């Protein structure tokens, strides 16, 4: 009788530890022993404890980045330029496995693109008709 009660107890603990919650805004990526099991919607869900792991990622929220710098223009001129970049996460497996720390990579890419675009234009043209 002891073995049956022990089995009942261990399966009860298994089920109790199986449940987890994912916030409404976020999504989840579940991997069973690191094999990318599937994509998990928000709410209450169940997973085999000590077998698969779930990583939550904020998808609904909109992320903003600020990029500022002293930048050289075409007519041997330097200007302080500030930009804001709004971006959102999609297909979270790409956001999680393609590039380490995607936010820093996007920051560096934004700085590079800003330098490339600002290099072409002259100072007065920027200062007057920049925005568009």
């Amino acid at each position: 009788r002891v073995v049956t009660i022990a089995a009942a107890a261990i399966v009860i603990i298994w089920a109790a530890s199986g449940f987890y919650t994912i916030k409404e805004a976020e999504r989840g990526v579940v991997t069973r022993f690191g094999k990318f099991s599937h994509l998990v919607e928000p709410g209450l869900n169940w997973k085999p404890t000590f077998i698969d792991e779930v990583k939550p990622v904020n998808v609904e929220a909109v992320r903003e980045l600020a990029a500022s710098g002293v930048m050289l223009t075409s007519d041997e001129n330097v200007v302080r330029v500030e930009m804001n970049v709004q971006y959102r996460v999609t297909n979270p497996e790409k956001y999680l496995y393609s590039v380490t720390s995607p936010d820093d990579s996007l920051r560096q890419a934004t700085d590079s693109a800003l330098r490339g675009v600002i290099g072409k234009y002259t100072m007065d043209r920027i200062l007057t008709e920049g925005r568009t």
Binding site: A61, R63, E64, L65, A66, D103
Partner: protein, 63 residues
């Protein structure tokens, strides 16, 4: 995640913080890129809330 108070400050002055929730000594800090980390107040700072407000940072109280 646990992050110390100083770098939280120069993140605040460099406006990477969006929402800060202060239940007790601890602060639940959310960055502009939706990355959240907890911070602990070493000692009460009268200038802390003023600095947070001037930098247009969202501040949330707790029950």
């Amino acid at each position: 995640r646990k992050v110390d108070y100083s770098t939280f400050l120069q993140e605040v002055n460099n406006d990477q913080v969006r929402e800060a929730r202060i239940n007790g000594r601890e602060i639940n800090v959310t960055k502009k890129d939706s990355n959240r980390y907890t911070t602990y107040i070493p000692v009460q700072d009268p200038k802390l809330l003023d600095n947070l407000l001037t930098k247009n940072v969202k501040v949330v109280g707790e029950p």
